[PDB]
Amino acid sequence: ATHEVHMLNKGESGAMVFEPAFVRAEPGDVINFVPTDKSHNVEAIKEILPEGVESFKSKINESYTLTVTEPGLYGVKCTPHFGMGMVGLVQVGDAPENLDAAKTAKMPAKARERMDAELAQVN
Ligand SMILES: [Cu+2]
């Protein structure tokens, strides 16, 4: 299955956001990060990444494709807008092995606010 996440300056959900900010996926799924606005990218939050998964960091203003096969939680940030809370979360499979790391990972205050809102969607 494919998924689409827009990178926005000012969405309904706030300034500097991934929309949707939470994605439920299954192994083999493709997630496309789309620059609806300029100034954004996507980068893994190394504290919120499943076992095996290579770090990644996309170029500003471009699309990025993330293929997910390892189960668990994948935390993503926009590199220049992490401080402003531009973070997202992908859950692959059901109960995630790295749930607690996501709950406790150090990040800027607005990022932690948004990450907590995302963690509440964990199915
Ligand atoms: Cu951004």
From Swiss-Prot:
Residues 104-123 are annotated as: Disordered. It is found in: Periplasm. Residues 5-93 form the Plastocyanin-like domain. GO terms for cellular component: periplasmic space. Its cofactor is Cu cation. Keywords: Copper, Electron transport, Metal-binding, Periplasm, Signal, Transport. GO terms for molecular function: copper ion binding; electron transfer activity. Coiled coil: none annotated. Cu cation binds at H40, C78, H81, M86. Disulfide bonds: none annotated. Binds 1 copper ion per subunit. This soluble electron transfer copper protein is required for the inactivation of copper-containing nitrite reductase in the presence of oxygen. Homodimer. This is Pseudoazurin. It comes from Paracoccus pantotrophus. The gene is pazS. The chain holds residues 23 to 145 of 145 of the full protein.
